[PDB]
Structures are given as C-alpha cells and as structure tokens.
C-alpha cells in the first residue's frame, strides 16, 4: 500500500527521502502528495495556480522544480512566490506566469508590483461594513416621524 500519487511516479531513496515526478501528466491541481516528499518536480504540466498552504504540511520538502507551467499569476499565487524566494531564489529567474497577458512578459522574479497582481492591502472604500448601509437607513427613520 504505497502512498504514491496515482498519476505520478515516486521513488524512495534510503538517505534522501521520497522523490516524486509528475512531469508531463497534464495535471491541473496538485495530487495527493504524501507526508515525506523531499523532492517534487512538476515541470511541463498544465498547472494553473497552487492552492495556498499546499506545502505547509510537508516539512521535509527541499527542492521544487516548477518551471514551464501555465501559471495564472495573481494574488492567489503569492504562496508560491514567497515559497520560492524563501527556498529556491534562483527559480524566480526561470518560472513564468501565463495569465494575465500583462504579466507574461518575463520571469516571475523581475516583475514590478503592478504587473505582479498589484494587491497588498485591499483598502476597500467605506461603503460596506454594514454600519454605513444601516447608517443611511438610520437617517431614513429621521425623515419618518420627527
């Protein structure tokens, strides 16, 4: 009963853990990666965007080859970017995001804040947080029976 992902080829090295290969399988979402994968290659797939916290439960992961993928680089891709910059900085010079067409003109690392999904603090305008919605209703009661 191996913990190997079904559309993936995984091998166990005695002094190097679990090495999984999912290149060319046409994946769209991350498969069920076991709990002891130390290397993980996903190059040349159809991956769109990694779900946040996907690798947060895999302590031993140390190498991540993710180049040549159709990444939809937006806010949801932050988890990937901050991962690479924390573990494999050089990979930021070779991984590229496919969409939007504005951001598909270079590697992920050398992108300005605007073209890299320009979302830091989402300062939504003060017309929500339904005090305001009811506040106006409040003054409506003012016009009712004063």
């Amino acid at each position: 009963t191996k913990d190997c992902p079904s559309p993936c080829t995984c091998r166990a090295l005695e002094t190097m853990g679990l090495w999984v290969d999912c290149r060319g399988h046409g994946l769209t979402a991350l498969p069920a990666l076991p709990a002891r994968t130390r290397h993980l290659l996903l190059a040349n797939n159809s991956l769109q965007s990694v779900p946040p916290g996907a690798f947060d439960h895999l302590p031993q992961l140390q190498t991540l080859d993710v180049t040549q993928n159709p990444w939809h680089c937006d806010c949801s891709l932050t988890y990937l970017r901050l991962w690479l910059e924390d573990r494999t900085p050089e990979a930021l010079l070779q991984v590229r995001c496919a969409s939007p067409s504005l951001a598909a003109h270079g590697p992920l690392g050398r992108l300005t804040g605007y073209q890299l999904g320009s979302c830091g603090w989402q300062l939504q305008a003060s017309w929500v947080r339904p005090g305001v919605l009811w506040d106006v209703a409040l003054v409506a009661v003012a016009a009712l029976g004063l």
Binding site: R11, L13, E14, T15, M16, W19, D21, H39, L41
Partner: peptide
C-alpha cells in the same frame, strides 16, 4: 549505488 532522477545516493553502503 542508488540513483534517482538527477540525484545519486551512494551513501551508507
């Protein structure tokens, strides 16, 4: 010795 992908494991043997 063992050999997977681009890595080689020749240790502990």
């Amino acid at each position: 010795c063992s050999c997977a992908g681009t890595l080689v494991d020749c240790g502990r043997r």
